[PDB]
Amino acid sequence: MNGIPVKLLNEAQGHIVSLELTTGATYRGKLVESEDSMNVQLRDVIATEPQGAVTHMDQIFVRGSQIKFIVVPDLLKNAPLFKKNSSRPMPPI
């Protein structure tokens, strides 16, 4: 399945992220819902074109394979996904 980083992207739902795209566009806004395939949907999006302008989308849906990176907020530095030793409470049967 997923692996740690896209699990983090599944964690940072509804919080102010910033995306660069491969075009150089860095969308920024609240993260409505990410998928496992890194297609991410965003709201109140403020966009920076490659030309240097800035605009405001309301409701964007950027495809995963043109994301350059994504920045989540800082606090997720401390996240239970990163805990190397948290033991599993008897998986279901």
Partner: protein
């Protein structure tokens, strides 16, 4: 940088090191890797991203280089648009300290499972 990186270590051994991962654009990300995956999606804590400008690139040609850094902090970079990663700083806490820390984490985890077994009773 005289850092003397571990001659038999790969990604999982490189954890919590300060990396200098480099991309297809030629942008550099600098920060603590805290996780990777199969596709080499990295997280990068406290990350700073540096470019060279097109103009400073002329000075880079065959020296002091005005690299442009923006600060991306906790970012989570992708395995598609990267090139290669190297290691820039060793982590904060040494091998004995990391080892004792992992011991304490495991003891606390076993204890939390004992508490789950107690609440289950």
């Amino acid at each position: 940088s005289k850092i003397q990186v571990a001659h038999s270590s790969r990604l999982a051994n490189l954890i919590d090191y300060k990396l200098r991962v480099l991309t297809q654009d030629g942008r550099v990300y600098i920060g603590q890797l805290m996780a990777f995956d199969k596709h080499m999606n990295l997280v990068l804590n406290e990350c700073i991203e540096e470019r060279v400008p097109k103009t400073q690139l002329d000075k880079l040609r065959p020296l002091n280089i005005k690299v442009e850094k923006r600060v991306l902090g906790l970012t989570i970079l992708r395995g598609e648009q990267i090139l290669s990663t190297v290691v820039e700083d060793k982590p904060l806490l040494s091998k004995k300290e990391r080892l004792v820390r992992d011991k304490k984490e495991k003891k606390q985890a076993q204890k939390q499972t004992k508490l789950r077994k107690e609440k289950e009773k």
